[PDB]
């Protein structure tokens, strides 16, 4: 209840014994869970996910192109 109450807890006790493991493994599983969700997720849950995934793909198209055009200058 101070001002950085949880951040002190980190700086004094650490995150967990296993917080690096659960994290890193969840980062990997994502690639599958994404594909499982794009195959499942019927109806409006899926029709939003595919439209979410496209805005994610044009954003990446911009980021790749605007980086490799300004490589010369």
């Amino acid at each position: 209840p101070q001002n950085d109450y949880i951040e002190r807890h980190i700086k004094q006790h650490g995150k967990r014994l296993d917080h690096e493991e659960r994290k890193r493994k969840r980062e990997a599983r994502e690639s599958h869970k994404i594909s499982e969700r794009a195959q499942k997720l019927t109806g409006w849950k899926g029709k939003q996910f595919a439209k979410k995934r496209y805005a994610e793909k044009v954003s990446m198209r911009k980021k790749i192109k605007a980086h490799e055009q300004s490589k010369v200058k």
Binding site: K11, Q12, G14, K15, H19, E20
Partner: peptide, 10 residues
């Protein structure tokens, strides 16, 4: 530093 201890265990 307390930040490097996670690496010390693994």
């Amino acid at each position: 530093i307390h930040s490097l201890e996670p690496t010390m265990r693994n």
